[PDB]
Amino acid sequence: KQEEERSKVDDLRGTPMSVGTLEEIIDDNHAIVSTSVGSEHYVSILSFVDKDLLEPGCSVLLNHKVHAVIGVLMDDTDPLVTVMKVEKAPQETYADIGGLDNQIQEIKESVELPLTHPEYYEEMGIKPPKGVILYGPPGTGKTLLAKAVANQTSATFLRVVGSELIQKYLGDGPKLVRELFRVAEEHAPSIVFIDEIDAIGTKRYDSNSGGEREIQRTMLELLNQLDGFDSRGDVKVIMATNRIETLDPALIRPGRIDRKIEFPLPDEKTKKRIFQIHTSRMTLADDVTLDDLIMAKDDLSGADIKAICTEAGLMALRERRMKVTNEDFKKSKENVLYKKQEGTPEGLYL
Amino acid sequence: VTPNCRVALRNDSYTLHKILPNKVDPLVSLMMVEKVPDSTYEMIGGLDK
Amino acid sequence: HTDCTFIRVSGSELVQKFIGEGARMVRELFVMAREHAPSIIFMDSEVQRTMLELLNQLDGFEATKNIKVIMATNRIDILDSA
Amino acid sequence: ENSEKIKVNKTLPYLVSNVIELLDVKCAVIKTSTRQTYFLPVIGLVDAEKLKPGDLVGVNKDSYLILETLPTEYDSRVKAMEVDERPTEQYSDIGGLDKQIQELVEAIVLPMNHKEKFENLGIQPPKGVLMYGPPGTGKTLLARACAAQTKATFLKLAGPQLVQMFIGDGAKLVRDAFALAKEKAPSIIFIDELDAIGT
Amino acid sequence: QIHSRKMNVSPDVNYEELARCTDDFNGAQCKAVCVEAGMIALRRGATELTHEDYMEGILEVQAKKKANLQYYA
Amino acid sequence: AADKQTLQSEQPLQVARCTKIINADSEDPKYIINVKQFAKFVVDLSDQVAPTDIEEGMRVGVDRNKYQIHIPLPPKIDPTVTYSDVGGCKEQIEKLREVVETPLLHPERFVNLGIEPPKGVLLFGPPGTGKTLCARAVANRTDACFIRVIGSELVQKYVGEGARMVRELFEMARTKKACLIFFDEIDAIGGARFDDGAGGDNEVQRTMLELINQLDGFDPRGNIKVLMATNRPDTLDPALMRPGRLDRKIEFSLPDLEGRTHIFKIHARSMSVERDIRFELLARLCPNSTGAEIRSVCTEAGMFAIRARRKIATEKDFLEAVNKVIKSYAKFSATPRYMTYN
Ligand SMILES: Nc1ncnc2c1ncn2[C@@H]1O[C@H](COP(=O)(O)OP(=O)(O)OP(=O)(O)O)[C@@H](O)[C@H]1O
Numbered sequence A: 001k002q003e004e005e006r007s008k009v010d011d012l013r014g015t016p017m018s019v020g021t022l023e024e025i026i027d028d029n030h031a032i033v034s035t036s037v038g039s040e041h042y043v044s045i046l047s048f049v050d051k052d053l054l055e056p057g058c059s060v061l062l063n064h065k066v067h068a069v070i071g072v073l074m075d076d077t078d079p080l081v082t083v084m085k086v087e088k089a090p091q092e093t094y095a096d097i098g099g100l101d102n103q104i105q106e107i108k109e110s111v112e113l114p115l116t117h118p119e120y121y122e123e124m125g126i127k128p129p130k131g132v133i134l135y136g137p138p139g140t141g142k143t144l145l146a147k148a149v150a151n152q153t154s155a156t157f158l159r160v161v162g163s164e165l166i167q168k169y170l171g172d173g174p175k176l177v178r179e180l181f182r183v184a185e186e187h188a189p190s191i192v193f194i195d196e197i198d199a200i201g202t203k204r205y206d207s208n209s210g211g212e213r214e215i216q217r218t219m220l221e222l223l224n225q226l227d228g229f230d231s232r233g234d235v236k237v238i239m240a241t242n243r244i245e246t247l248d249p250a251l252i253r254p255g256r257i258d259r260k261i262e263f264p265l266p267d268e269k270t271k272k273r274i275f276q277i278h279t280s281r282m283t284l285a286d287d288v289t290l291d292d293l294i295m296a297k298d299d300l301s302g303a304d305i306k307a308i309c310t311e312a313g314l315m316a317l318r319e320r321r322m323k324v325t326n327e328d329f330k331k332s333k334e335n336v337l338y339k340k341q342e343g344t345p346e347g348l349y350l
Numbered sequence B: 001v002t003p004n005c006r007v008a009l010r011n012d013s014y015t016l017h018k019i020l021p022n023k024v025d026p027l028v029s030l031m032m033v034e035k036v037p038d039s040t041y042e043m044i045g046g047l048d049k
Numbered sequence C: 001h002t003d004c005t006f007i008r009v010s011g012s013e014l015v016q017k018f019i020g021e022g023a024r025m026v027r028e029l030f031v032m033a034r035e036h037a038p039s040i041i042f043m044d045s046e047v048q049r050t051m052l053e054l055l056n057q058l059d060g061f062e063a064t065k066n067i068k069v070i071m072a073t074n075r076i077d078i079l080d081s082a
Numbered sequence D: 001e002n003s004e005k006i007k008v009n010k011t012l013p014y015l016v017s018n019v020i021e022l023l024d025v026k027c028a029v030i031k032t033s034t035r036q037t038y039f040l041p042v043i044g045l046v047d048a049e050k051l052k053p054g055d056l057v058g059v060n061k062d063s064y065l066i067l068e069t070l071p072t073e074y075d076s077r078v079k080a081m082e083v084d085e086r087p088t089e090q091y092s093d094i095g096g097l098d099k100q101i102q103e104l105v106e107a108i109v110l111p112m113n114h115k116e117k118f119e120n121l122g123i124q125p126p127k128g129v130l131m132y133g134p135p136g137t138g139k140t141l142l143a144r145a146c147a148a149q150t151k152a153t154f155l156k157l158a159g160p161q162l163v164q165m166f167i168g169d170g171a172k173l174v175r176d177a178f179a180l181a182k183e184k185a186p187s188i189i190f191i192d193e194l195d196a197i198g199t
Numbered sequence E: 001q002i003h004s005r006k007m008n009v010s011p012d013v014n015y016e017e018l019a020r021c022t023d024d025f026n027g028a029q030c031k032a033v034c035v036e037a038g039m040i041a042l043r044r045g046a047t048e049l050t051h052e053d054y055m056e057g058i059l060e061v062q063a064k065k066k067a068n069l070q071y072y073a
Numbered sequence F: 001a002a003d004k005q006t007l008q009s010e011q012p013l014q015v016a017r018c019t020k021i022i023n024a025d026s027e028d029p030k031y032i033i034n035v036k037q038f039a040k041f042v043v044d045l046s047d048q049v050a051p052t053d054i055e056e057g058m059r060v061g062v063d064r065n066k067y068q069i070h071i072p073l074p075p076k077i078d079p080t081v082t083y084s085d086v087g088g089c090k091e092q093i094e095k096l097r098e099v100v101e102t103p104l105l106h107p108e109r110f111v112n113l114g115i116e117p118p119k120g121v122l123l124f125g126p127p128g129t130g131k132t133l134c135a136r137a138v139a140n141r142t143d144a145c146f147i148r149v150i151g152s153e154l155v156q157k158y159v160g161e162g163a164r165m166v167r168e169l170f171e172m173a174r175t176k177k178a179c180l181i182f183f184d185e186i187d188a189i190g191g192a193r194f195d196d197g198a199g200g201d202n203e204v205q206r207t208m209l210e211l212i213n214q215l216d217g218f219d220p221r222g223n224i225k226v227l228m229a230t231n232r233p234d235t236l237d238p239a240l241m242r243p244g245r246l247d248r249k250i251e252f253s254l255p256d257l258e259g260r261t262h263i264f265k266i267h268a269r270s271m272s273v274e275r276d277i278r279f280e281l282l283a284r285l286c287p288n289s290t291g292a293e294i295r296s297v298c299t300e301a302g303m304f305a306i307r308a309r310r311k312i313a314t315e316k317d318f319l320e321a322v323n324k325v326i327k328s329y330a331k332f333s334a335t336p337r338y339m340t341y342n
């Protein structure tokens, strides 16, 4: 039966089996096999697995003793495959409209609509945007928008931190670039997101060789693999920073990165929805006016709205009061915002 | 087989033999790098808000 | 006097060795703080990196809720303002 | 004896390694090509005068005896720096610097031929000549002219050939380049763009 | 002339005209003018070198070129 | 089990480790081999091989017990490799036409006038400009051959493997006629012999010397044309600034006004627009730009053609495309808002 011949192939397999990289097809079914250290006898292949699945120079299943080619490889999994491949569409498409409302449309019709409906480009002959940078003040919504398009997705979403690629072994970074874009290739049209790559410029590290000539090579592999060859087709890639100065302009140049999208701090019309929805789930003495908080602070982030709208509940619930007086918003905003440069030292502005 | 949990591997034929319940990183060297016990509140005096 | 819930790893001691050297994504500490879910983390270019992985975990993606990460320094706060 | 000693060289290829130093408390320190150290108080089948520290030697895998000296110490880049072609340039090409040809020959060519011209008078030979001017006036012409016309092993040297990112001493390429050239080129050495390193 | 020794040179060449109307050339530029006479003579596909092409090399794209006749009138 | 029985007869047959040759001794085979990592070796042969073809820079079969030489093979074999807009920047394809076209066509301009064929050009210019356009625009007229090599592909951890790829390339260029191998990032390839008694980055160096040998000198080019892309003629080699090698140095920065109108034609016909509009106003609006940026302008007018339902692109879609890209996309969205001039 097939269990007997299958067990015979299993007995061709000697239980310590190794994993080694091919170099070249030697066409007459005896091959020559590199290990990680490359001890390469003229070994043969177990001739029931398909030899013609693999290109030359691809990893296989081997033996220790005779080193004979036994089986086919499956994948490569690192601590990054767990993190690069996002498992679920996590959460938070939006809990509050009124965050930005401007570049929401821009990321929507720039990223979502060419992806979700790629038939407009037939009508007009337009290429899709390949690289878009999302950058500005810290904690604007950029990471939150990455989790938005992560949740409101249509693709195999990929989440990458830019500092994941930093190793001490030689070539290890570009190897994880190759596994990286292999992941970016072989699922479906996937949304790659890469964040905090403004912290790859003036950066020197401990677990490292010669610093100026290590990550130059890895980022060089990013420049070659990212938007050089290997036909983009439909592979969405979105990166994000906070600053711009350490950016090598060789990737900033078009072809590679197409759209550079800033982020302002929100205006008072959009503030009211963030103030309101951050207060949508709390007991509040509604006689107080949020418009003092909406008017007063001029360059708030939404974390300032968050911190005040939690902090006033820390001041009312500090004394077991379910609803919040206006002076708890006073101590709230004066507790959040510190070192208000108004008078004292110079205050030349008066 | 738990993913990324470590095992006791024999050197015999590399027979996958036992599974080791363990923590992975330097956890010992700095995982438990606390200052353990000390004293009480009485020697503070003033920053009570 | 919180009986389990304060594991002051002190987070800056050999700073060019306890941080990033061996523990790149210093999240080894975060695996400590999760698998010792009563804990409190304390601290005093790599600092920017590990800073960013702090911000990769503690920006709304958190298991035992907040732990208590604390840094302390003095006299001017002109560390990198991200 | 020598049947089994040919056998010791024959066992495997008898791992060519490096001598680190040599003491005489006759005694030598081996670094394998596996980068592993093995002191021996007994050298074996060669003489300590024949070798020196920093050599490629054949060592038994088993006895760890210094078996033979390799005839493969060829020295990368230098032995490639020795110009073996020797392109021709007679002095008909040098137009306008004929007095510099004369002081050139009196300075350089005659110390190669006749030191009795110097030391029957009994002082010294000359020591080093500087060529300078605009860079199209011709500084290669003395190199190829003295290469072909004066029958000696023309050796060349460039300026940026003394700067490698990887550091640790300036005494390997230099000292094994001239200590290289003490035998198979001890008459002609052309340094070029010395102003690129003379800072 | 050492550069134009092996090249096919028409006898309608006065080297003293050429090198006399040269000002401030090194032999890097003697070679540059002579090989650029080979290349300017090589553009139209002449059978040999021509004295005009030597004279054209004499002014290989006006050294630094530019030639704005603004302010010089 | 298609062939399981013979596999149980192949188990008494297992030999021949990888074992790249270093060099040889004299009068005798007496070869010398490093394996990969372990050590270096003064080897001897199994007697049933050919002692001729154990030449240097090769890997033979080698036993495990005696390390005796079994048969070699060349390592790197068969899998290596996979223009109406001829005319962009103007005077570049004329000099390219000279140095490339004239040895491929006439040894009448050269030998009858008494010169050597100009065989290479050092291309220098900013990226995103058309080195790809010019070099692949050569491939219209040779026959149809073009090979594309990035220098940074050769960053490996094996001695002379880049130089082994120099062997592979200079033994593939001679197989076919009128072929084009492209060179790029030639600063990491090296022109200056950086060296100090430490011995680090030298696969670059020996690969560069193998590049000198197989490039020019030692069987001249013929029907092989190779250009070199750089930003700098600075870190080069005087052995390759040997003037029979690379003597033209074609220059290019930007199109003037009307090359930009030509690229307006190129990226205009390549998309759905309206044919009732002009582009010289846009070439006025583009002082300093690449044609890739022109393509970004045309796709941005495509974006306004997405917003409104447009397939015949008006002038104003391009007007807001340029006012987007050059003005509302220079740094932020405000380079103007002061009159003071008009
Ligand atoms: N409805 C809203 N309108 C405007 N801004 C908002 C709104 N909701 C949240 N924000 C802001 O956007 C940010 C969302 O989290 P974000 O990912 O920006 O934090 P972060 O991780 O610090 O970002 P970064 O790492 O880029 O600095 C919050 O800091 C908040 O201030």
Ligand SMILES: Nc1ncnc2c1ncn2[C@@H]1O[C@H](COP(=O)(O)OP(=O)(O)OP(=O)(O)O)[C@@H](O)[C@H]1O
Residues within 6 Å of the ligand: F085, F087, F088, F089, F126, F127, F128, F129, F130, F131, F132, F133, F184, F229, F255, F259, F263, F266, F290, F291, F292, F293, F295
């Ligand atoms: N002078 C030009 N004429 C026509 N199109 C041009 C011109 N300059 C730029 N382009 C356009 O911009 C693109 C620039 O990309 P290209 O294919 O040349 O790669 P590249 O980056 O320019 O090559 P390289 O960076 O090694 O010079 C061209 O493909 C073309 O669409």
